[PDB]
DNA sequence: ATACGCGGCCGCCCATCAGAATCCCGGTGCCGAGGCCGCTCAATTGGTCGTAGACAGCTCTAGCACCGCTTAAACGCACGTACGCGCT
């Protein structure tokens, strides 16, 4: 009973810019948002995610710092918890 | 002149001696392992040198994997035409 929505290199941008505008909305219900590596880097930013949860590094040094860049932006107050 | 006798002929069952035919034992020709063998020239034996190629080190191509934006190609189905194939 997770509300969330994915986010990877298939769908195409009309979808994934309704599921970005969705997830901005300050009364969504969807507090997982899935990602990938070079589509969760890819570009964009989200405001409203702080938790940042890797289940492994992808093979590349820096891309983590990267891949949390964008969630952990400067308009999160809420601190960023990795 | 008138009546009796018979004579070989013959069907009959009944007897003797040779020939035909099946079984009990056979020789003959064909095929395929064997043996013999012997002069001998190709393999084996003992031996040296050297070189291919195994092997370990190394680096440096390219085969894999993986992803996502884009879209041509595959898919499945609907409808009918023009062939497969059956008959004569």
Redesign the pocket.
Known sequence: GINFQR???????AQ?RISIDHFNSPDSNDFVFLL?????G?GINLMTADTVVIFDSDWNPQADLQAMARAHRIGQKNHVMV
């Open positions: 986010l990877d290199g298939t769908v195409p941008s994934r990938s590596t070079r589509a969760g890819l």
